[PDB]
Design an enzyme around this catalytic site. Structure first.
Site, PDB file in Angstrom:
ATOM      1  CD  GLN A 160       0.038   1.714  10.656  1.00  0.00           C
ATOM      2  OE1 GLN A 160      -0.320   1.821   9.480  1.00  0.00           O
ATOM      3  NE2 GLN A 160       1.083   2.369  11.147  1.00  0.00           N
ATOM      4  CB  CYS A 176      -0.922  -0.007   1.235  1.00  0.00           C
ATOM      5  SG  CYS A 176      -0.167  -0.561   2.803  1.00  0.00           S
ATOM      6  CB  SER A 177       1.008   4.455   1.665  1.00  0.00           C
ATOM      7  OG  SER A 177       1.852   5.595   1.595  1.00  0.00           O
ATOM      8  CB  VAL A 226       2.500  -1.885   7.952  1.00  0.00           C
ATOM      9  CG1 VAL A 226       4.020  -1.957   7.794  1.00  0.00           C
ATOM     10  CG2 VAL A 226       2.058  -0.429   8.086  1.00  0.00           C
ATOM     11  N   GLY A 227      -0.435  -1.593   6.884  1.00  0.00           N
ATOM     12  CA  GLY A 227      -1.824  -1.610   7.316  1.00  0.00           C
ATOM     13  C   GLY A 227      -2.728  -2.421   6.411  1.00  0.00           C
TER      14      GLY A 227
END
Length: 286
Positions: free
Chosen positions: A267, A223-224, A227-228
């Site tokens: 996250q 993603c960015s 992790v999330g």
């Protein structure tokens, strides 16, 4: 912390939701604590030579599970912010990594070649709510060159909630020198929080997961920060596998496990609940 029979799992979700999600909160706090008595080193992430290669200063790649690039004729040319992560009953089924920076585009695609990755799962837009989340690492049209890797956009299908781009990549230093890479790009994603409905994401997970070919490198998920939403995907995909194999579910145990392989996977508590909603949709949909 044993597995939960699938036929009891939606009931389990009702209990976790009850009393303003008390049970969910307890589970997730336990996740966040399950690191407490663990020192996990990330020396390479913190080296001055590599700091510009990290999108976020606090989002690191644990040494023991970090993906290593083959060295180049710099002692630190081996670094990329990416970690192997296990899938269901399979070691290193994924590489979880940040959205690449312009300065790490060459590293990004080199890793994809060296690891024999054939599927990219992108779970962010380049810009969300006017904010830069990821740099575009693929060609808008035709071909672009990233070091020794030339990437060619072959076809695109744009669905309501996600886009599939089919690439052919070539290594200019190989004389077997071309590979297909398919990118699954979830596009419908709220700047804040998680999508209100899980079904669209379930569908995205099923199709991007079914695209995995025998027998190839790990599926790259980003993603960015990587992790999330990335952890959310990995848990959903893996638990769908477990359900198929054994008709049981172990969200909490599996998540505590992969948390040792990349920091902060899944996250927030909202993402943790969303995983459950997605699995609920799968179970009830059957």
């Amino acid at each position: 912390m044993e597995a939960i029979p699938v036929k009891q799992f939606v009931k389990h979700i009702g209990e976790l939701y009850s009393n303003n999600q008390h049970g969910f909160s307890e589970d997730f706090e336990e996740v966040q604590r399950c690191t407490a008595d663990m020192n996990i080193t990330a020396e390479h992430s913190n080296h001055p030579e590599n700091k510009h290669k990290n999108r976020y200063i606090n989002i690191l790649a644990y040494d023991h599970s970090r993906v290593k690039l083959r060295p180049l004729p710099s002692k630190h040319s081996d670094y990329i912010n990416a970690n192997y992560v296990d899938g269901y009953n399979k070691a290193k089924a994924y590489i979880a990594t940040q959205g690449p920076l312009k300065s790490t585009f060459e590293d990004f695609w080199r890793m994809i070649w060296e690891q024999n990755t054939g599927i990219i799962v992108m779970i962010t837009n380049l810009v969300e709510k006017g904010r830069r989340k990821c740099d575009q690492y693929w060609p808008t049209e035709n071909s672009e060159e990233y070091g020794n890797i030339i990437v060619t956009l072959k076809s695109t299908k744009i669905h309501a909630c996600y886009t599939v781009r089919r690439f052919s990549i070539r290594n200019t230093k190989v004389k077997q020198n071309e590979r297909v890479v398919i990118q699954y790009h979830y596009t419908q994603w709220p700047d804040m929080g998680v999508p209100e409905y899980a079904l669209p994401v379930l569908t995205f997970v099923r199709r991007s997961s079914a695209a995995r070919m025998p027998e190839t490198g790990p599926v790259l998920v980003h993603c960015s920060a990587g992790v999330g939403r990335t952890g959310t995907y990995i848990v959903i995909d893996s638990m769908l596998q477990q359900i198929k194999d054994k008709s049981t579910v172990n969200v909490l145990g599996f998540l505590k496990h992969i948390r040792t392989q990349r920091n902060y996977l899944v996250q927030t508590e909202e993402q943790y609940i969303f995983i459950h909603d997605a699995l609920l949709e799968a179970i009830l949909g059957k």
